[PDB]
Structure 1
Amino acid sequence: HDEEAIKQTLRNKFNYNTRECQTINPSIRERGVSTEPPPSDTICGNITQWE
Structure 2
Amino acid sequence: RNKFNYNTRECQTINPSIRERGVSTEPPPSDTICGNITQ
User: Which TM bucket (shorter chain)?
Assistant: 0.5 to 0.7
Shift of 1:48: 1.7
The answer to which structure has the higher helix fraction is 1
Name the TM-score, length of structure 2 as normaliser: 0.58
1:13 & 1:42 partners in 2: Cα distance? 88
**Matched residues, number:** 39
Q: TM-score, normalised by structure 1?
A: 0.50
Q: CA offset at residue 12 of structure 1?
A: 9.2
Partners of 1:13 and 1:35 lie apart in 2 by 66
- Rg comparison, structure with higher value: 1
Unpaired runs of 5+ in structure 2? none
Query: Which stretch of the first structure deviates more once superposed, 14-23 or 25-34?
Result: 14-23
For structure 1, which runs of at least 5 residues remain unmatched after alignment? 1-10
